[PDB]
Amino acid sequence: LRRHAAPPSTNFEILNEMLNTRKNMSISLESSKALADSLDRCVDPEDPYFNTLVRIMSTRCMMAAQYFYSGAYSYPDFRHYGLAVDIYTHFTSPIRRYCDVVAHRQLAGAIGYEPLSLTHRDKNKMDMICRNINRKHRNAQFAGRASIEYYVGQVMRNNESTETGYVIKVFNNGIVVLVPKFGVEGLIRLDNLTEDPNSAAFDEVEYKLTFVPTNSDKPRDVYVFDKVEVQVRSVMDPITSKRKAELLLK
Amino acid sequence: KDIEISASESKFILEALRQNYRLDGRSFDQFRDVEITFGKEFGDVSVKMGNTKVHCRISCQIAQPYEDRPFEGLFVISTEISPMAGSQFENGNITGEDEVLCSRIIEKSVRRSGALDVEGLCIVAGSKCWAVRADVHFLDCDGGFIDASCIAVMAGLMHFKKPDITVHGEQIIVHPVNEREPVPLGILHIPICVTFSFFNPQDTEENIKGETNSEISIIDATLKEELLRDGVLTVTLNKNREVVQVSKAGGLPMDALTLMKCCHEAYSIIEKITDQILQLLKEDSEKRNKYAAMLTSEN
């Protein structure tokens, strides 16, 4: 089986401070229907993507669902929280999920086709499996995102553009911008975010890094989730050999 | 304390097998019909196969585990015969042989086999666990006890539930029974034993050097049937077609080719009876829940 837990308010209040002090909203966290209906109301009209903008962002703190044998725990611990079902396995893709193939085998006795194999009955051998097959699935999408990485890592190698990038973090060191067309982040650190960093003032409650710019001098109140001009680029960092997204505000 | 039967009666049944008859009315390879009925308590059941009647009981309580397996809970089966079930028996002889012949089977049938997860008795490791108890009572014998106690214990495990637990170091919170529900138990596999009963119609030598296999084997010896048999054999299996135990401890000599041919017929027998338990467990709990439906609407 496969179980999914609740991301609590602790994974959501730090968004809620950005949702309240800046956006004057929050999440429900009572039920994940009510949460999914307090997430349906956190959309701004001038940006209909601000629906989707939270969806990709609350992704980072969702509970890691994992395969397991039902003898490990009890029945409401068989829950899939994100999919609202008290019982949950995977079945329908044998080739990319060896997890499903085993579920054929213990079904093979459930219809009476065949005696079950012994190692499909030893919870000692099962716990060795259920961690590892998750760990292979962990070893999948870390490369599945990285499939996009080097294939984005060649894009901005010599094709720069001035576009829209979204600030997802306002910090004192600078802000992290993110192109929704591209999905690759970059900290525009404060000095390359703005000239006169002594006039730059980072706020923690409003989460604003208000300043006068590098290319200009108007008092720029750098809030969150607004729209900017930003120059994209990439140069591989020669001390790490990761093709960093050279992202520079404009 | 000795059962006395005439040698005239001894030849009589031995003749009946020689003309393929047996006194009960079953076939040779036919088993009795089983009546399973539960008491109101969980882990309470009365099991009855015609004349043989049994009763067992499952319970549990709090204890510490051993040093030996400090991970796991505690569990043991009592099978103390009372001379109620027949005047042959001593008052609680735990040192009689047939008792041991009843004992070690159910010892291997349950404990060494492990139908029950003892690790799922670990409340807290090394501090507090469960002590699960299985007291087997015999009521009246027509044989098949070791098959009956095979069933009635495994019947009882699928009807017992244990109450609710909450841990804070020493603050171990056993909850009230009726606010927080009792919780049933984890059965890895369901074993069913089969008595086999053996009759030489001949002398020793025609079994020994008489090459012709001529030995009759039946299921579920009745009381009079059981007193003349020549070998004793019990096998145990599951639904997943694995063999739990085999025990031919001596007696009559016996062909190997018979035994496989014997044990295959065990399989089709035990499977149907197994599922009959499985519905009745459901159906009684359905009757529990339909009467729970007849309770909350009533209250």
Q: DSSP secondary structure string, B204-220?
A: SHHHHT--S---EEEES
What value does the CA radius of gyration of chain B take, rounded to a whole number of Å? 22
Experimental method for this entry? cryo-EM
B169: Cα separation from own chain's centroid: 39
Residue A228 φ then ψ, to 5°: -130, 170
Bridge partners (DSSP) of residue B171 are B168
With H, G, I as helix, E, B as strand and everything else as coil, classify residue B175. Answer: coil
B183: which chain A residues are within 8 Å (Cβ-Cβ)?
74
Angle between helices B97-106 and B145-157 (to 10 degrees): 40
Neighbour-count burial of B273, counting CB atoms closer than 10 A to its CB (0-12 exposed, 13-18 middle, 19+ buried): middle
A118: which chain B residues are within 8 Å (Cβ-Cβ)?
242
Neighbour-count burial of B145, counting CB atoms closer than 10 A to its CB (0-12 exposed, 13-18 middle, 19+ buried): buried
Is residue A116 within 8 A of residue B240, CB to CB? The reply is yes
Q: How far is B240 from chain A (nearest CA, A)?
A: 5
State the virtual CA torsion across B273, B275, B277, B279 in degrees, nearest 10: -140
DSSP-derived pairing of the beta strands B128-140 and B74-78: parallel
B14 Cβ contact partners less than 8 Å away, ≥ 6 residues apart: B199, B201, B228
Residue B297 φ then ψ, to 5°: -70, -30
Cα angle B145-B82-B55, degrees, rounded to a multiple of 5: 50
Measured CA to CA, the distance from residue B222 to residue B47 in angstroms comes to 17
A123, A124, A125, best to mutate vs chain B, most B CBs in 10 Å: A123
B141 Cβ contact partners less than 8 Å away, ≥ 6 residues apart: B51, B52, B85, B86, B223
**Closest-CA residue of chain A to B114:** A122
Is residue A170 within 8 A of residue A207, CB to CB? The reply is yes
With H, G, I as helix, E, B as strand and everything else as coil, classify residue B236. Answer: strand
Instruction: For chain A, say whether B242 makes contact (Cβ under 8 Å).
Output: yes
Measured CA to CA, the distance from residue A35 to residue A55 in angstroms comes to 12
Bridge partners (DSSP) of residue B216 are B199
Instruction: For chain B, say whether A121 makes contact (Cβ under 8 Å).
Output: yes
Facing residue for A116 by CB, picked from B117, B183, B240: B240
Facing residue for A109 by CB, picked from B186, B188, B240: B240
State the virtual CA torsion across B201, B206, B208, B212 in degrees, nearest 10: -90
Measured CA to CA, the distance from residue B186 to residue B121 in angstroms comes to 10
CB contact under 8 A, B242 and A71: no
What is the resolution in angstroms? 4.6
CB contact under 8 A, A109 and B239: yes
DSSP-derived pairing of the beta strands A2-3 and B183-184: unpaired
Q: How many CA atoms lie within 13 A of B184 on its CB side?
A: 14
DSSP secondary structure of B103-162:
HHHHIIIIIITT-B-SGGGEEETTTEEEEEEEEEEEEE-SS-HHHHHHHHHHHHHTT-EE
* 3-state SS string for chain A: CEEECCCCHHHCHHHHHHHHHHCCCCCCCCCCCHHHHHCCCCCCCCCCHHHHHHHHHHHHHCCCCEECCHHHCCCHHHCECCCCECCCCCCCCCCCCHHHHHHHHHHHCCCCCCCCCHHHCCHHHHHHHHHHHHHHHHHHHHHHHHHHHHHHHCHHHCCCCEECCEEEEECCCEEEEECCCCCCEEEEEHHHHCCCCCCCEECCCCCCEEECCCCCCCCEEECCCCCCCEECCCEECCCCCCEECCCEEC
Q: What CATH class has A161-250?
A: mainly beta
Instruction: For chain B, say whether A116 makes contact (Cβ under 8 Å).
Output: yes
Measured CA to CA, the distance from residue B195 to residue B186 in angstroms comes to 27
DSSP-derived pairing of the beta strands B161-162 and A185-189: unpaired
Measured CA to CA, the distance from residue B61 to residue B130 in angstroms comes to 5
Is residue A12 within 8 A of residue A29, CB to CB? The reply is yes
CA-based nearest residue to A17, from A202, A246, A204 = A204
Distances (CA, A) of B164 to B44, B91, B178, B289: 19, 38, 10, 20
**Closest-CA residue of chain A to B115:** A121
Cα angle A12-A14-A37, degrees, rounded to a multiple of 5: 35
Facing residue for B240 by CB, picked from A71, A115, A123: A115
Measured CA to CA, the distance from residue B33 to residue B142 in angstroms comes to 13
Angle between helices A123-153 and A98-108 (to 10 degrees): 150
* Tokens at B244, concatenated: 């739990």
**Closest-CA residue of chain B to A124:** B119
What value does the CA radius of gyration of chain A take, rounded to a whole number of Å? 23
Residue B3 CB neighbours (<10 A): 10
Measured CA to CA, the distance from residue A231 to residue A140 in angstroms comes to 32
Measured CA to CA, the distance from residue A27 to residue B272 in angstroms comes to 55
B36 Cβ contact partners less than 8 Å away, ≥ 6 residues apart: B45, B46, B47, B48, B151, B155, B276, B277, B280
A164: Cα separation from own chain's centroid: 20
CA-based nearest residue to B50, from B177, B220, B287 = B220
Q: How far is B112 from chain A (nearest CA, A)?
A: 15
DSSP-derived pairing of the beta strands A185-189 and A201-202: unpaired
Cα angle A69-A70-A74, degrees, rounded to a multiple of 5: 140
CB contact under 8 A, B239 and A121: no
Measured CA to CA, the distance from residue B187 to residue B157 in angstroms comes to 8
Bridge partners (DSSP) of residue B232 are B197
Measured CA to CA, the distance from residue B45 to residue B49 in angstroms comes to 13
* Tokens at A124, concatenated: 């000692």
Is residue A1 within 8 A of residue A70, CB to CB? The reply is yes
With H, G, I as helix, E, B as strand and everything else as coil, classify residue B31. Answer: coil
Measured CA to CA, the distance from residue B289 to residue B274 in angstroms comes to 22
Residue B164 CB neighbours (<10 A): 14
* A24-33 CB contacts, 8 Å cutoff, 24+ apart: A32/A6, A32/A81, A32/A82, A32/A84, A33/A84
With H, G, I as helix, E, B as strand and everything else as coil, classify residue B173. Answer: strand
Is residue B72 within 8 A of residue B65, CB to CB? The reply is yes
